[PDB]
Design a binder for this molecule. Structure first.
Ligand SMILES: Nc1nc2c(ncn2[C@@H]2O[C@H](COP(=O)(O)OP(=O)(O)O)[C@@H](O)[C@H]2O)c(=O)[nH]1
Ligand SMILES: COc1ccc(-n2ncc(C(=O)NCCCS)c2C(F)(F)F)cc1
Ligand SMILES: [Mg+2]
Length: 163
């Protein structure tokens, strides 16, 4: 059965853990210990293929992190649409992933999370322009409502498959 190794990165509080828990448990967490970093497994069928997703939920700024980063096959780069700084921070995550992989062609999806909230300070167009400069998709998500969550993770799988 095919395994896909996914790594979820981004600034504190953007909803990395909430996105992962929503994907797996179909539940929205209001507060999740920000120090817990672990990998989680989910068996899914994607485009008729039974897949095992091995998802590293990163935390902090570690051996485990360095290990999945080096062997990680695709990256969700998450910001929150009500957190301008987290959007601005994306570039640091992408630059580090490129360094790790020594490549500018890394399977990656830009994720704008918390799209259920009204205090939007990052426009969709801004994030689209950033994603276009990186040559990657942009997808908006809400870990609260589940909007976009499956699309973000499964699109990352389809990006890994083009690689
Ligand atoms: N309204 C809303 N809150 C979210 C969403 N995703 C995460 N949160 C909330 O934002 C905070 C940080 O989430 P968390 O997953 O711990 O962020 P992390 O530091 O990136 O792992 C929590 O209070 C979560 O309930 C979302 O999509 N919508
Ligand atoms: C605003 O300035 C910032 C500087 C550094 C970071 N930060 N925190 C952890 C990591 C990391 O290495 N994660 C693993 C990457 C390989 S998988 C990084 C980054 F260097 F990438 F960005 C965030 C914001
Ligand atoms: Mg977390």
């Amino acid at each position: 059965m095919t395994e896909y190794k996914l790594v979820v990165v981004g600034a504190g509080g953007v909803g990395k853990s909430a996105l992962t828990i929503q994907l797996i448990q179909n539940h929205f967490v209001d507060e999740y210990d920000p120090t817990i970093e672990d990998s989680y497994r989910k068996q899914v069928v994607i485009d008729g293929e039974t897949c095992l997703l091995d998802i590293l939920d990163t935390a902090g700024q570690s051996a485990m992190r360095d290990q999945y980063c080096r062997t990680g096959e695709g990256f969700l780069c998450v910001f929150a649409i009500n957190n301008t700084k987290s959007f601005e921070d994306i570039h640091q995550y992408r630059e580090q992933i490129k360094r790790v992989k020594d490549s500018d062609d890394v399977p990656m999806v830009l994720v704008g999370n918390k799209c259920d909230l009204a205090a939007r300070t990052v426009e969709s167009r801004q994030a689209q322009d950033l994603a276009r400069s990186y040559g990657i998709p942009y997808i908006e998500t809400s870990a609260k409502t589940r909007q976009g969550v499956e699309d973000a993770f499964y699109t990352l799988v389809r990006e890994i498959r083009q690689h």
